[PDB]
Design a protein around this ligand. Sequence first.
Ligand SMILES: COc1ccc(NC(=O)N2CCN(C(=O)c3ccoc3)C[C@@H]2C)cc1
Length: 121
Amino acid sequence: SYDIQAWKKQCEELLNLIFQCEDSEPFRQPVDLLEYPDYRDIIDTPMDFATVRETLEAGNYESPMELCKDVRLIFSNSKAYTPSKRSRIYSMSLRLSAFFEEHISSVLSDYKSALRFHKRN
Ligand SMILES: COc1ccc(NC(=O)N2CCN(C(=O)c3ccoc3)C[C@@H]2C)cc1
């Protein structure tokens, strides 16, 4: 399966599944800086799933590795803000991360395989 472009629709479908997860609600939109005025004191690079979807649709990701880095930044940023290992948001961030990682693994493998096939000769 050596389609170099296939990752983009696969990532759009996975973002649709993440939007349907109730566990995504707190990560869907950019954190309101007025609601949390100290957010930018701790978080250097804000990220959320609407920003990831818009970047993808703008044609501003070259590879699924770049999309994966931004999704992993949502989860690291949530971990940097949260106050407990038994925080509600933290419990949701960890379930959503496991779901994301389970599904992105084949997207990354297939992309890297397709690029190796393109370079094979
Ligand atoms: C009183 O009811 C509530 C319950 C939950 C919240 N949400 C939060 O505390 N959050 C801070 C940590 N987050 C993030 O750092 C992040 C957001 C996108 O990517 C990461 C998630 C989210 C915005 C606010 C009020």
